[PDB]
């Protein structure tokens, strides 16, 4: 799932799945 | 930042993990 173009909710979903209990920061700026 | 790396170009696990806490 990670090796593709990931935008918006698709990118946040990938961060959520990869980062698990660490969580993550989403900084589109 | 992440949009340039993963949305407008092809993402990678390596790059995604840079955004994990």
Could you walk me through the main structural features you see in this protein, from its secondary elements to its overall organization?
Chain A: This is Insulin B chain. It is classed as hormone. Keywords: Insulin, hormone, glucose uptake. Chain A is mainly α. Chain A has one domain (about 1-29). In chain A, about 40% of the residues lie in helices and about 0% in strands. Chain A is flat. Chain A starts with 8 loop residues before the first helix and ends in a 10-residue tail after the last helix. Chain B has helices at about 1-5, 15. Chain B contains two helices and no strands. Helix content of chain B is about 50%, strand content about 0%. Chain B is mainly alpha-helical.
SSE string of chain A, helix = H, strand = E?
H
Proportion of residues in helical segments of chain A:
25-40%
**Secondary-structure element order of chain B, N to C:** HH
User: Which secondary-structure class do the elements of chain A indicate?
Assistant: mainly alpha
Question: What would you report as the Rg of chain A, rounded to the nearest angstrom?
Answer: 9 Å
Terminus-to-terminus distance of chain B = 16 Å
Radius of gyration of chain B, in Å, reads: 8 Å
- The number of helical segments of chain B is 2
Task: Give a short synopsis of this structure.
Helix content of chain A is 38%, strand content 0%. Chain A has 29 residues and is mostly helical.
Spell out the key features of this protein:
heterodimer; A: mainly alpha; 1 helix; 38% helix; B: mainly alpha; 2 helices; hormone; Insulin; glucose uptake; dimeric; Insulin chain B
